[PDB]
Structures are given as C-alpha cells and as structure tokens.
Amino acid sequence: SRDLLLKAKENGRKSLLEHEAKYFISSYGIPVTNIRLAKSEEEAVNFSREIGFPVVLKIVSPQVVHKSDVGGVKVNLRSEEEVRKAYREIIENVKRNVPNAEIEGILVQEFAPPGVELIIGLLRDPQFGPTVMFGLGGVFVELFRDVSFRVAPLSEQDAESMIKEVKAYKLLTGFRGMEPVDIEAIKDALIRAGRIGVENEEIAEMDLNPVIAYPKGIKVVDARIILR
Amino acid sequence: SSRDLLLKAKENGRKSLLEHEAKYFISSYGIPVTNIRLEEAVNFSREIGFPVVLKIVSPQVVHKSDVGGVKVNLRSEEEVRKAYREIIENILVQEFAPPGVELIIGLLRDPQFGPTVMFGLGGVFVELFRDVSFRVAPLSEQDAESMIKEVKAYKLLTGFRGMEPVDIEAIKDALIRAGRIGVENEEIAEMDLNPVIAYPKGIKVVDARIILR
Amino acid sequence: NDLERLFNPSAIAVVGASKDPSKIGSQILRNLLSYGFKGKVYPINPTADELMGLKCYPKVSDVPDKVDVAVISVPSDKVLGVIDDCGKAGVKFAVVITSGFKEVGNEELEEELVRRAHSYGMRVLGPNIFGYLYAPARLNATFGPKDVLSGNVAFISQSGALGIALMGYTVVENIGISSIVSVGNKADLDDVDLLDFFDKDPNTGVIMIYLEGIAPGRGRMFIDVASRVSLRKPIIVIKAGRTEVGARAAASHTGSIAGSVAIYESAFKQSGILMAKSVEDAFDWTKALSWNPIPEGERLIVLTNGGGAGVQSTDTFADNGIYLSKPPESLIQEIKKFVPPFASFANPIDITGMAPDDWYYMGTLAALKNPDVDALTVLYCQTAVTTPIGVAKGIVDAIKEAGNSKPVTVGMVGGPEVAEAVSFLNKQRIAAYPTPERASSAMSALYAYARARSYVMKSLAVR
Amino acid sequence: DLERLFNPSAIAVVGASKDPSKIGSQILRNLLSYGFKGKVYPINPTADELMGLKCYPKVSDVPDKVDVAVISVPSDKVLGVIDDCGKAGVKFAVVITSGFKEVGNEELEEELVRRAHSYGMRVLGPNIFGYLYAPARLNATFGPKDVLSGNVAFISQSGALGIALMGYTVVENIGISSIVSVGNKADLDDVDLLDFFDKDPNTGVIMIYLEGIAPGRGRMFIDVASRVSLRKPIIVIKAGRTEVGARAAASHTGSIAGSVAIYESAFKQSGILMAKSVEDAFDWTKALSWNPIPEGERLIVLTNGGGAGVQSTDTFADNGIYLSKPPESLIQEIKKFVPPFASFANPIDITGMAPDDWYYMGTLAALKNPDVDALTVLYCQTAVTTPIGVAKGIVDAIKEAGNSKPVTVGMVGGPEVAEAVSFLNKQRIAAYPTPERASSAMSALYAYARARSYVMKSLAV
Ligand SMILES: CC(C)(COP(=O)(O)OP(=O)(O)OC[C@H]1O[C@@H](n2cnc3c(N)ncnc32)[C@H](O)[C@@H]1OP(=O)(O)O)[C@@H](O)C(=O)NCCC(=O)NCCS
Ligand SMILES: CC(C)(COP(=O)(O)OP(=O)(O)OC[C@H]1O[C@@H](n2cnc3c(N)ncnc32)[C@H](O)[C@@H]1OP(=O)(O)O)[C@@H](O)C(=O)NCCC(=O)NCCS
Ligand SMILES: Nc1ncnc2c1ncn2[C@@H]1O[C@H](COP(=O)(O)OP(=O)(O)CP(=O)(O)O)[C@@H](O)[C@H]1O
Ligand SMILES: Nc1ncnc2c1ncn2[C@@H]1O[C@H](COP(=O)(O)OP(=O)(O)CP(=O)(O)O)[C@@H](O)[C@H]1O
Ligand SMILES: [Mg+2]
Ligand SMILES: [Mg+2]
Ligand SMILES: [Mg+2]
Ligand SMILES: [Mg+2]
Ligand SMILES: [Mg+2]
C-alpha cells in the first residue's frame, strides 16, 4: 500500500521490512519477486505453493544484520518437505547463534535465476533533492563503484544516458555472445524510481539491490528503504 | 627436458600445446597446477582423488561447454563412469578446484619490450572490466608486488565482505616465474593461465593455454 | 525578480567611505569615480562633509535622491543600523562588503540581516564580498583593480580572495569582461538570481562561475534555470572542493557510495554546464567560447607544420572524445596546389616544417572557405624559415577573407617572438595559446559545449 | 663513450656556404655566436673562407684531428662525405640531412650506418636539427642562437617541435645543459644518450620527447632508465597515447593488451614520469631542476586565500597526495602574528589581509620546522599587498632557510603578479601563475620521490 511509509513513520520506524518495501515498490509498477511473510511452518508451505517453486526463505529479525552469517537464509527449496526442513533449521539456527534475537517471521519469496545483477538507488541530496543512481549491482557494487547519478524527475534522455555512461554497460548489449538484456525495462524502472523519490518526501535512501536484468523484463530481488 | 614438449609440438606442425602438455611444462617451472593424468579414466581418478573433472581431448576443441564434452564435480566411480561414456556421443582426468578468487596471468610478446606479463581478475568477465596490469619481464619482486596492488579488484585479495584474504606471495612467485618462461623460451608467442584460483594458502592453475610460433 | 537597477543604477551610496584612504570604503569610492560611473555617487559618513569632491551625507535617508543601491563597508556591529536606514530610504539593493557573519559562525545575525532587508522589499548581495562590476554601465563597485578589459564574459565568484585576484588575471589572459560579481556568503541573492539576469543581458555572452556550493533546496531551481540559459549562452563552472571524503558508511549502499561531488557533476551535466578542474582550463575555454561560434558539425580540421605538434593535438582531442576524420578531398586537392607531395593529409594536415608564412595563409583560407569544414585548429612550431608574426598576420588575414564565422583556435610554440605573436592574436580576439595541447583543449571546449547544448535539447524534446 | 661528442676539441661543418640562408651556414653562425672555444672547420668545395675562418674542401684536408663532423649536404652526397670523414678518423657524424628511412629509403640509411661503422664511428640521426651542449659552449644546431644555462638535458625525436621547444625553454626560464635531436635514430638513440647523461655532472634532469623505440630495444631502455632514475629524474612526453583498435588475437592476453598500456608500465618500471602535455613537462622539469626531493609526506600549503587553498588541495588529491594536520610547533610559531580567526587545518590560511611581511615569516617558520618536508606557497593579489614585496619575502625566507626543502609558488593576479612570477623564476624558484600548476609541480617532486623508491626497491639486492 502507498501509505506503508506513513504507518512505518508513526511507529518510530527508521526503515521498511523487505516485504513491505517490495509491496511499496510494486505499487509503482516496478517488477518484484513475489514475496510473503510466514509466521508459521504451515503458512510457509501454503505461501510456497502460492508462489511456486523453487523458493527462498529469509529470517526477519532486528538483531540479525547479516543473515547468511547466522544461517538465516535458505536458497532453492523445491518441495514442501524441503521447505519445512529449512523453516525449522533457520529458526533453531538463529536461536543458537544469537539467542537474544527476537523473531518477527520468515519471508518466502520466488527464486530468481541468474542474470545481469544491477543496482538502482535513490538518495535525497540536501541541494538537489531526489537523485537516482544506476550501475552494476550484486555483491560487488562497492568494489567497482561503477555508477552514474541523475537528479529526478528523470527524462528519457537522463535515464538513457546514465545507462550508456557506466563502463559495465557492455553487459547489456550482449557480451561473450550472450543475449542482450531488456534496456527499456531498466529505463522505465529508473524513471519510476525517480517518481518514488519526488512523491515520497519521507524517503531518505533506497536500495534496489540486486535487480536482475533478463533478455525480457527485470526483477527486483531485494529492496531496502531508509526513512527519515 | 621440458623443452621436448615444445620441440615435439613444433615438428608436428602444432601451433599450440595440449592442455596436459601445457600443464606439465608450466609445472616444471614451479607454478602450481591441478595434477593431471593421461576404465583408464577411473583408475587415474582414484590416483588423483575426488572430486574430479573430465574433459574430452579432441583435435577440434573449440568450445567444450557448448558441446557438452566436459563433466564437472565427479565424486564417485559410478558417477565418473557415466561421463566417460556419455560425453563421447556428444582419457584425460583433472583435479577439481574448489571455488575461490579467479585470477588471470598472461604472457605476451611486444615488438618493443618483448616478454610481458599480464595480471588481473580472471573468470568469464576478464576482458569486460579489463582491470589488468602489465610488466615487462624479467619481473623483480617489486614489479610483481606493485602490478597486483594496481588493479581495481585487488580488494578481493585482502578480505572483502568478511571473505578470507588470499595468498599474495604465491601470486607474486607465479608472476615472476611466468616472466622467466617468457624470457627463456623464444618459441612461445602467447600464454594464458586462466583461471588461476587463489586460495587462503597457495594458488592453482585450473586451465592453461600456450600458443607457439 | 529584476536586477536591472542593481547593475544599471541611477544612484549609488557608499556607506563607510572615509577621509582615510586606506579604508576599504574609500577604495570602493575611488574605483567608482576612476572607472567613470555616470550616475550619482553619494558618500555616506557621520562626520565627513565632503569626500572625493562629492557632497557626503551622514545617512542614506538624508540623500535628496532616489538611491537604487547602497554599498555597505561598516563593521558587522553597525550593519543593521545601516540596513534600517536604507529601508526607509527605499533602497532596492544592499551590497554588504562586511565580514563576520555565517562564514565565521554568526548565522543568527545573517538571517536577521536578510529578514529586515526583505521587510523593506529590498534584496541583499553578500555579505562577505568584494563588491561587483558592470562594464556596460561603467560601474566598478569593488576594491579590486581600477579597470578590466571590456568584453562579453560575466564572472561570478563565491570566493573573495581568489575572485579579486582573478579579476586582475583576466587582464593578463586578455579576457574581456562584461561583469564581475562577488556573491560571498550567498545570504539572499545567489547564482540562480544572477543567472536569470545574465540570461537577458545582451552584453553578456559567456558566464563563468567559481562555485563552492549551493544552498539546500536550491539545486533543482539551479538546474532548471541553468539548462535554459545553457541553450543560448555557455556556462563554465569551477567547482571548488571536488575531492570526496569517501566511505560514508550509511544504512544503505546508495547512501555509502553516493557523494555530493559526483552529484554536482551530474547536476552540471543535466544543466548543460561545462565543469573545469582548474583556473587555467576555465580561462582557456572561456576565451574560445567568447570569441567563437559553436561548430555546426564534426568536420574539424587540424593544420600543422610539424608532425610532433600534430600528434600532441590528436592525443589531446582523443582525451576529450574527439576523433579526427579524413579531410574532404576538395580541401586536399586545394592544398596540394602549393604543398609538396611528401606532405600528409591524414588529418592533422601536415604541411611540413619548411612551410613558409604564405602557406599558413593559403591553408587556413582554403580550410575556412571549404563548405565541408566546420572548425579549424592551427598549430605552428617556430622555425628559422618563418616568422611568428608573419604566420600570425597570415591567419588573421585568412579569417577576414573567409568572410564567415567558423570556430578557430591557434597553438604556437617557440621563444619570445612566438610569445609576442600569441599576444598579438589574442588582442585581436583570436584564441591563441603557447602550446598545441592548450589550443586543442580550447577547441574541445567548443565541442563540449555543443554536446552539452544537445543534451539539454534532447531532454526537453517534445515527446 | 660520447665524451668526444659533447666535448669535442675540433668540429667540422660540411655544407656551409657563402649563402647565409643555407642550413649549414646557420649552424656555423650558431657555433661561433654561442662561443665555441675549440677549432671550427667550415667545409665547402669552392669557398676559401667562411665566417672569417679558413675553409677546406674536405675533412681529410684539415690539419687537425676532427672529433665531430656536422653534415648538411643532400642525401645523395652524404655517403661520399661519410667515406671522407672515415679516412680522416672522425669519431662522430651528425647527419642533419633528410630523405632516409622516414620517407621509405631504408636502404640508404642502412648503408649509411654500415660504412660509418666500418671506420669505427657513430652516427647521430639522420633527420635531426643537431645538438647543443652548454658546458662546452657548443651550439651545433640551426635553432635559436642561445639558451639559458642550467642542468636540464632535452632529447627530442621530433625535429619541428624539438626546435620550437628549444626556443620555448627561454620563455619558461628553463636552464639547459644540453639539447639533442635524435631524429631517425638510425644508430645512436635514447639509450646511449641516457647512459652519457647518467654520468654527466652538468645534467641533473632529463626530458625526452619520445615517439617510439626500435623493436628489441625496450628491455635495454628500462634497464638503463631505471638506473639513471636512481639519481636523476627522467620526464618523458610520450607522443601517441591514443590506443588503436583492439586486436583480435588467439588469447585473452593478446586481445586485451595494448601498446599504450605497456608503454605506461615500462615507464613505471623505469621510474619515469610521463607527461601528457608539453606544459606539464616544462612545469615539472622546472621544479625538479631547482629543488631536492622531499624526504617525507609532511607537506604544508600556505595561502592568504581559502579559494586558492581549495584548488591546491583538489589538485593534490588528483595526484594521490593528501595533506595532514600541521605540526603544533609550527601552528604556535605562526599564531604570534596572525589573527585568531585564521585557519590551521592545512592549507594554513593566513587570511586575505595578510601583508608582505607575513609571507616571509610564515615561509621561514615552515621551512625551519624540522617536521615540515615540503612547502607550497599560494598568493592571491590584494590591495593590501604588492606581488613583488611578497616575492622578495619568499626569496629571503628561502635564503635564510637551509635550501634543503622543496618549494613551489603559485601567484594569481594582474601584470604585477606576472612580473613577480618572472622574478621568482629568474632566481631558480619554481613559480607559476595558478595554484593548480604550483601544486602539480610539487606533485611532480613527490611522484619522482615515489618513482625513485620504486626503482630502489626493484633493483634492491
Ligand atoms: C567592513 C570593514 C571593511 C570595515 O572596517 P573599517 O573600515 O576599519 O571600519 P570602521 O571602523 O573604520 O568604520 C567604517 C567607516 O564608516 C563610518 N561609519 C560607521 N558606522 C556608520 C554608519 N552607520 N553610517 C555611516 N558611516 C558609518 C566610520 O566612522 C568609519 O569612518 P571614519 O573614518 O569616519 O571613522 C570590516 O569590518 C571588514 O568586514 N573587513 C573585511 C573585508 C573583507 O574581507 N570583505 C570581503 C572581501 S572578500
Ligand atoms: C641537407 C640539406 C639541408 C642541404 O640543403 P642545401 O643547402 O640546399 O643543399 P646543397 O645542395 O645546396 O648543398 C649545401 C652546400 O654544400 C656543398 N657541398 C655539396 N657536396 C659537398 C661535399 N661533398 N663536401 C662539402 N660541401 C659539399 C654544396 O656546394 C653547397 O654549397 P654552395 O652553396 O657553396 O654551393 C637538404 O638536403 C635537406 O635535407 N634539407 C632539410 C633537412 C631537414 O629538414 N632536416 C631535419 C630538420 S628536423
Ligand atoms: N530471490 C532470490 N533468488 C536467488 N538467490 C537469492 C534470492 N534472494 C537471495 N538470494 C541469495 O541469497 C543470498 C543472501 O541474501 P541476503 O539478502 O541475505 O544478502 P545479500 O547477499 O543480498 C546482501 P544484503 O543482505 O545487504 O541484501 C544472496 O546473496 C543471494 O545469493
Ligand atoms: N577444474 C574445475 N574446477 C571448477 N570449475 C571448473 C573447472 N574446470 C572448468 N570449470 C568451470 O567450467 C567452465 C567451463 O569449462 P571450460 O574451461 O571448458 O570453458 P571456458 O569458460 O574456460 C572456455 P576456454 O577454455 O576457451 O577458456 C569454466 O568456465 C569454469 O567456470
Ligand atoms: Mg539482499
Ligand atoms: Mg578454461
Ligand atoms: Mg615535417
Ligand atoms: Mg686539435
Ligand atoms: Mg580567507
């Protein structure tokens, strides 16, 4: 819902939970991996079938910054039973590695096959305000810092030029004989990201990371929205 | 003499060395390589230790992965035997290299400076980022040490995202030795060590390519 | 709003002038008279009855005339007193020379200053500025140099010490000024307001801004205005402080890698602005932008008597994303009428070292007249066969006879005589430089501006 | 050994003529004009006297052992002269003549070198404008009559640009020890000349305009240039930096590697400073010529204006130099005369109202402080000051100091500042009309310090 930012702010929250961020992003027409928040093993299985296999499970705790490190993430679950295994394994994993940690729930989300990992950012600058960022995403975002910036709202020129300027742009036009990815989808995502910035003053920072680009369309795998 | 591999190749009008020959020749210079051997397959598979990798060795090996002539991560005799027969329709056994930082080490002939060594992050996205460095051989320890710190991706080698830092000294030694190969062997035109997996301790050449002239 | 009466006032009041000449107020008054201001000048001083032969009043309100501007050079303790007086006198603009405000911590006083000024419906320039100059109105309200060369360049500096020094430096580099404006603390009036004025000012054709930074919430407006301006007039910005602190370590990757520096660069790109990393670059580009029209196409020709200089040029152009194509056959033939057969036509067109002065005239002329040539960079290396001044007059004559306006830049290398020749050319408003790289960089600025303008046009393209 | 080339006792000028406009005659006039003390023997078939000197028709007719023969005759006549010089025992042939390999005639150039070697003599060029050596008052070129004396050695592969730059050194106050044109590089090249300038105590800096080196000569170039770099800075202006179309090779290495990237690496291994522009080359040369290398990274910037200080900092950062906090001793020492609202974050802003005296005191304080390794002084012209006054202050402060620390100066302003900069440069103090150029010059000093460090390590036993 568009008002999710409001509810978060009134609850003294400085950020949105992954599933909330994804709902909010989706309501602006940016494609996202279908996600649900399970609060029981049974709800998990149900949501797993409602989403379709294979699926991914993530713990939702405030005291767990790096989930993978505590074994709070299970990837590529293909069967109901495999899902139940993972559901319990994550819970017990978190309790052992971080007992104090409170549990909010388990996130079930569609599995995203491999592809060009991109990042789409949104930052509020004191001078220029809503600003959009683009570049190679994934885990190695900060390593190359191969990025571009544009002040919102973005024209088609702005979005198109900020894509061609990054060095990694070569990946998007077919590299190693690879099939070129959907650039128009990316442009649309960038323009819409800009709109989110302009219309939502309470957003300080936003991270669409990773954003998998395929030959046809794109998908936001993970999102992070920092409020102010 | 390792030179006999080069000589035999030349007399057979061969303008390049076969993967196992290249690995033997590289190993004789002190560069670590995944140990190789030439039913016969399974026997060497047990002699090398699991898991293993099998690649067809045909006169025309343009792009194996595309032809399905290679089977990866074989852990059991039975699983190995599947591929030995199965790839054919589409006897060289190779050690399996666990995941790690993929690097490239090159050697090229420049008209001006002659034998030149290249370094940088390898893998599939080598030429895309082109994050590489060059040094004219022979390489001092300073040369080898500096050309590593120069590449953007160097950060991967010092512990990134809590990842464990890799053995930098091993890489330096490999680079210096690579340079020596270039200087001492005039019949070598180009050489490609790609990928070269760097681990917390030591490194291993997974695949090698030696172009003769 | 409108700043016409700020740059073209009928009456100006110099508050802070004194019998003591060493005082800043007195320096401003002297510059005002020496530079030849046609309007009325009203020295304001408590005790002084006459200053510089002008009737001196103790307060602006005591002046029997509608004062448009008040230059204020009194201690920060006394500024507010003067602001109230200017208010009741109906003054439109307060140019506050005084220091000791936001820059030193006292932002409280600064906001107060602005509020009162706004209460009387009058704007504030500064505070912490060295004043401003406007040549078309023979107005020099600064304590900088007495004079500048007249021209179409407007220079807006956020920095005072560097601003005033550069004011003198424009003379050395033969840059013709239309206006010098110190904006200092930018309490009220800023670059946006000044950009609006210079957009309309037919006397100004190029704008150069030394920018330390802009006020929060002002950036969007800066882009909106600057992009519009950029379509007609080039804007060069010297961004002060362009070195990132690095590693922000925020609650997100975007927060952590995004830096204000990189955002300013993007904002400048979107505004069609050219960003200079150095004062020398800024001045080199300004000169070429002030004296040349933008190229209509990519058919740039380089003409050199030395292959070595030609290669330096090619490297420099390439660094700026400019690649030279084969010259048109019409031009090649036209040049082969006097050039030896062992000359080059790969572009740069090497006319060989032994080329006499006459060839520089013919080559330049042939190029300029050729309808398939959009731009021309002429490189010369001093040799005994030639005289620098001879080559210089040849180039000038060729430009006259061409009877058109195609962008030209000149690079000359050599000793004292070449230095004299470069000055000669620049004094005739022909962009000349003492090295091939600088000449090619200047030409690259013309193309950079063309590309900038094209960027804005595309983004404003009616879908 | 090229000692006989740069310090010859006797030199012949083949190709001189009654006609002054001819190149040989220009060379002869420069040889006399510049003040060569040795014997000069004009050589011409008919002329009996030239420039008041006994002219012979052949070198072998000269009653004296000639060390060097400058040859200015058409290509078709060059070989004959070479044979004559051979029979005369000449050690060096400086071939001005064009029309050899550079225009396709490889055969003639090859033969030229062969005969020259047959007599055991070396060849400079061909296709050069000559060479100059100030310590011997020797100007064997047809360029300008004179250059300022100093410790810089300039080697140009390009003729037109080489001669032009030779004149340009005067305008930029660069003191020259030697100008050498190498042209076609048929025999003697940059390697050989580097070897000589390595030993020559008259040369402290070496600048090279390089278009390229001969195949199979690069390794030798690195070996020599590294060793030279241990003691003397080498600046190179690499002509041809633009990468050509990527080759489609049989390997990733061949496909990625470019000649440009390799040249940059070769220069790195040699401890050579690569300049992308003539301007940069001259600025850096000047600073390297007149200053010792900094011993540490404690670099102080001293400015009367914050704006100039920011421009300095930005430029220093682009060259991988970052300013640290200045030592407390220096801060207090300076606080004795500056206002309290001054800055000490480095750049030490002594505020715009600073008069001339403060520049002497600040400069002196910094230079004597044992925790300061280098000083860049920036000045923005204000009515409070005179550029010349500030200049004299800096000069005096340096004299009083130990002259053991590098200093650069950046001044911004009008005609008076221009005069002040010229004044400072004429006293061998690296001054520039912008803060960016002064800071780039200082960065050149640190770049070379790091370059020498690189070489010292790589050659370390
Ligand atoms: C504004 C400034 C220059 C004034 O310093 P100053 O000249 O020493 O000031 P004074 O104390 O002499 O007072 C100014 C003069 O105006 C007079 N004056 C004071 N208040 C006045 C008032 N309200 N109305 C009229 N005259 C007034 C004073 O009597 C004095 O003149 P005097 O010789 O008759 O006594 C100073 O405070 C300052 O800001 N200096 C820094 C300048 C600077 O760097 N600016 C930015 C450039 S980048
Ligand atoms: C070498 C070159 C400069 C000579 O030009 P030139 O002076 O017109 O040639 P000339 O035929 O007139 O010969 C010069 C003189 O040498 C004399 N000469 C010829 N052969 C001679 C010989 N064997 N011994 C002595 N003198 C000889 C000629 O008689 C003439 O003298 P003169 O005026 O008394 O008749 C010319 O061939 C050339 O290459 N020019 C350009 C070179 C260049 O650009 N160099 C590189 C600069 S980067
Ligand atoms: N929908 C999905 N499809 C496929 N793999 C996924 C996935 N969601 C997560 N993963 C995998 O699980 C890993 C762990 O996810 P997680 O979000 O916890 O960390 P991360 O690697 O994305 C950095 P950050 O925690 O800051 O987002 C990811 O790195 C990715 O490899
Ligand atoms: N021993 C090994 N251990 C781990 N992964 C291996 C491996 N041998 C091969 N691989 C993986 O399998 C992929 C396909 O193998 P292969 O070497 O035939 O193709 P390639 O991508 O290297 C083309 P080329 O051989 O021409 O460089 C490699 O890119 C690598 O990711
Ligand atoms: Mg994630
Ligand atoms: Mg491989
Ligand atoms: Mg030429
Ligand atoms: Mg003698
Ligand atoms: Mg200041």
Answer yes or no: are the C-beta atoms of C145 and C168 closer than 8 Å.
yes
Q: Do D256 and B127 touch (CB under 8 A)?
A: yes
Q: How far apart are CA C410 and CA C296, in angstroms?
A: 19
Q: Report how far apart, in Å, the C-alpha atoms of D6 and of each of C237, D1, D90, D121, D229 are.
A: 50, 10, 14, 15, 22
Q: Which residues of D touch C308 (CB under 8 A)?
A: 156-162, 209, 211, 239
Q: How far apart are CA B169 and CA A93, in angstroms?
A: 37
Tokens encoding D355: 């008069």
Q: Do C260 and A131 touch (CB under 8 A)?
A: no
The angstrom resolution of this structure is: 2.4
Tokens encoding C351: 């006319």
Say whether residue B160 is in contact with chain A using an 8 A CB cutoff: yes
Q: How far apart are CA B210 and CA C310, in angstroms?
A: 41
Strands laid side by side in the D68-71 sheet: D39-43, D10-14, D68-71, D92-95, D122-124
Number of H helices, E strands in chain C: 16, 19
**CATH at residue D121:** 3.40.50.720
Q: Which of A121, A155, A158 is the closest to C254 by Cβ?
A: A121
User: Are C201 and C145 within one domain?
Assistant: yes
Q: How far apart are CA D192 and CA D208, in angstroms?
A: 13
User: Are A85 and A175 within one domain?
Assistant: no
> Which residues form the domain of D391?
292-461
Last residue of a domain, one of D238, D267, D291: D291
Do the bridges between strand A55-60 and strand A73-77 make them parallel or antiparallel, or are there none, so unpaired?
Answer: antiparallel
In what helix (H) or strand (E) does residue D90 lie, and over which residues does it extend?
none
User: Are D123 and D243 within one domain?
Assistant: no
- Method underlying the structure: X-ray
- Single-letter amino acid, residue C404: N
Angle at B191 between CA B185 and CA B195, to 5 degrees: 140
User: Are A104 and A117 within one domain?
Assistant: no
User: Are D181 and D276 within one domain?
Assistant: yes
Q: Do C270 and A205 touch (CB under 8 A)?
A: no
Q: Which residues of C touch A (CB under 8 A)?
A: 213-220, 222-223, 250-258, 260, 262-267, 270, 455, 458-461, 463
Say whether residue A69 is in contact with chain B using an 8 A CB cutoff: yes
User: Are D272 and D143 within one domain?
Assistant: yes
> Which residues form the domain of A167?
1-33+112-228
User: Are C55 and C153 within one domain?
Assistant: no
Distance from CA of A177 to the nearest CA of B (A): 12
Tokens encoding B94: 């190779």
- Single-letter amino acid, residue C95: V
Q: Which of A66, A69, A170 is the closest to B128 by Cβ?
A: A170
Tokens encoding B38: 């030439």
User: Are B185 and B171 within one domain?
Assistant: yes
Closest CA to C202 of C381, C8, C425: C8
- Single-letter amino acid, residue D55: C
**CATH at residue C350:** 3.40.50.261
Q: Which of D213, D253, D255 is the closest to B107 by Cβ?
A: D253
Q: How far apart are CA D442 and CA C191, in angstroms?
A: 34
Tokens encoding C76: 């920060």
- Residue B65 marked as a ligand binder: yes
- The rounded radius of gyration (Å) of the Cα atoms in chain B is 18
Instruction: Determine whether the shortest distance from the Cβ of A61 to ligand 3 is under 6 A.
Output: no
Structural domain count of chain B? 2
Select from A16, A56, A69, A108 the residue to mutate for testing ligand 3; criterion: most ligand atoms less than 8 Å from CB: A56
Q: Report how far apart, in Å, the C-alpha atoms of B42 and of each of B38, B50, B54, B64 are.
A: 11, 11, 10, 21
Select from D21, D23, D28, D124 the residue to mutate for testing ligand 2; criterion: most ligand atoms less than 8 Å from CB: D23
Closest CA to A123 of A29, A224, A210: A224
Q: Any residues with CB less than 8 A from the CB of C58 and at least 6 apart, and which?
A: C44, C45, C46, C47
Q: How far apart are CA D187 and CA D66, in angstroms?
A: 20
User: Are C311 and C376 within one domain?
Assistant: yes
Instruction: Determine whether the shortest distance from the Cβ of A40 to ligand 3 is under 6 A.
Output: no
Q: How far apart are CA D231 and CA C51, in angstroms?
A: 65
Total number of residues shown for chain D: 461
User: Are C250 and C101 within one domain?
Assistant: no
Q: How far apart are CA A209 and CA C66, in angstroms?
A: 63
User: Are D189 and D121 within one domain?
Assistant: no
Dihedral through CA D342, CA D347, CA D353, CA D359, nearest 10? 120
Structural domain count of chain D? 3
User: Are B80 and B110 within one domain?
Assistant: no
User: Are C414 and C302 within one domain?
Assistant: yes
- Single-letter amino acid, residue C21: P
**Exposure letters B116-133 (e unless 16+ CB within 10 A, then b):** bbbbbbbeebbbebbbbb
- Residue D25 marked as a ligand binder: no
Closest CA to D302 of D423, D390, D175, D186: D390
User: Are C112 and C147 within one domain?
Assistant: no
**CATH at residue A69:** 3.30.1490.20
Q: How far apart are CA D287 and CA D410, in angstroms?
A: 12
Instruction: Determine whether the shortest distance from the Cβ of B65 to ligand 4 is under 6 A.
Output: yes
Q: How far apart are CA B30 and CA B11, in angstroms?
A: 26
- Nearest ligand to the CA of D27 is 2
Answer yes or no: are the C-beta atoms of A114 and C246 closer than 8 Å.
no
Last residue of a domain, one of A111, A132, A149: A111
Phi/psi at D341 (nearest 5 deg)?
A: -80, 5
Q: How far apart are CA D329 and CA C217, in angstroms?
A: 43
Phi/psi at D47 (nearest 5 deg)?
A: -55, 135
User: Are B142 and B86 within one domain?
Assistant: no
Answer yes or no: are the C-beta atoms of D53 and D25 closer than 8 Å.
no
User: Are A23 and A48 within one domain?
Assistant: no
- Write out residues with Cβ below 6 Å of ligand 2: D 14-15, 17-19, 22-24, 43-47, 72-74, 77, 80-81, 96-99, 127-129, 159
Closest CA to A61 of A20, A94, A13, A23: A94
Task: Give the residue, by CA position, lying nearest to ligand 3 atom 24.
Answer: A66
User: Are A175 and A225 within one domain?
Assistant: yes
Q: Report how far apart, in Å, the C-alpha atoms of B123 and of each of A75, B207, D347 are.
A: 24, 11, 46
H helix runs in C336-402, sequence order: 357-369, 388-402
Task: Give the residue, by CA position, lying nearest to ligand 1 atom 28.
Answer: C16
Identify the bridge partners of residue C302 per DSSP, sorted by sequence position.
Answer: C377
Last residue of a domain, one of B96, B117, B148: B96
User: Are B54 and B140 within one domain?
Assistant: no
H helix runs in D128-171, sequence order: 159-171
Q: How far apart are CA C412 and CA C422, in angstroms?
A: 7
Report A:39-58 residues touching B (Cβ under 8 A): none
Q: Which long-range contacts (CB under 8 A, 24 or more apart) does B41-44 make?
A: B41/B80, B41/B81, B41/B84, B41/B91, B41/B93, B42/B77, B42/B80, B42/B81, B42/B84, B44/B91, B44/B93
Q: Any residues with CB less than 8 A from the CB of C233 and at least 6 apart, and which?
A: C198, C199, C204, C205, C206, C207
Distance from CA of D147 to the nearest CA of B (A): 34
**How far does Cα D26 stand from its chain's mean position?**
24
User: Are B138 and B57 within one domain?
Assistant: no
Beta strands per DSSP E along B6-68? 36-37, 52-55
**Exposure letters C53-64 (e unless 16+ CB within 10 A, then b):** ebebbebbeebe
- Subunits touching C (CB < 8 Å, at least 3 pairs)? A, D
Q: Which residues of D touch C210 (CB under 8 A)?
A: 307
Which of the 8 DSSP states describes residue A168?
G
User: Are C15 and C46 within one domain?
Assistant: yes
Q: Any residues with CB less than 8 A from the CB of B10 and at least 6 apart, and which?
A: B187, B212
Q: Which residues of B touch D265 (CB under 8 A)?
A: 116, 133-136, 147
Distance from CA of A43 to the nearest CA of C (A): 31
Tokens encoding C457: 């046009």
Angle at A43 between CA A40 and CA A48, to 5 degrees: 125
**CATH at residue B204:** 3.30.470.20
Do the bridges between strand B188-198 and strand B208-212 make them parallel or antiparallel, or are there none, so unpaired?
Answer: antiparallel
Q: How far apart are CA D344 and CA D327, in angstroms?
A: 10
Widest pairwise Cα distance in chain B:
54
Report B:182-201 residues touching D (Cβ under 8 A): 190-192, 194
Question: Does chain C reach chain B with at least 3 CB pairs under 8 Å?
Answer: no
Q: Which of A69, A144, A171 is the closest to B152 by Cβ?
A: A144
User: Are C280 and C319 within one domain?
Assistant: no
In what helix (H) or strand (E) does residue A74 lie, and over which residues does it extend?
strand A73-77
Last residue of a domain, one of D237, D271, D291: D291
Q: Any residues with CB less than 8 A from the CB of C269 and at least 6 apart, and which?
A: C452, C455
**How far does Cα B209 stand from its chain's mean position?**
7
Phi/psi at C300 (nearest 5 deg)?
A: -85, 130
The single residue listed with the structure tokens 């390009």 is D158
Which of the 8 DSSP states describes residue A192?
H
Angle at C85 between CA C79 and CA C89, to 5 degrees: 140
- Single-letter amino acid, residue D47: A
Angle at D44 between CA D42 and CA D48, to 5 degrees: 80
- Subunits touching B (CB < 8 Å, at least 3 pairs)? A, D
Last residue of a domain, one of A81, A111, A141: A111
Beta strands per DSSP E along C111-231? 123-125, 131-134, 139-142, 150-157, 177-182, 206-211
Last residue of a domain, one of D127, D150, D179: D127
Answer yes or no: are the C-beta atoms of C154 and C204 closer than 8 Å.
yes
- Single-letter amino acid, residue D325: K
Q: Which residues of D touch C315 (CB under 8 A)?
A: 239-242, 276
For C308, the 3-state DSSP assignment is: helix
Q: How far apart are CA D345 and CA D431, in angstroms?
A: 24
Q: How far apart are CA D346 and CA D344, in angstroms?
A: 5
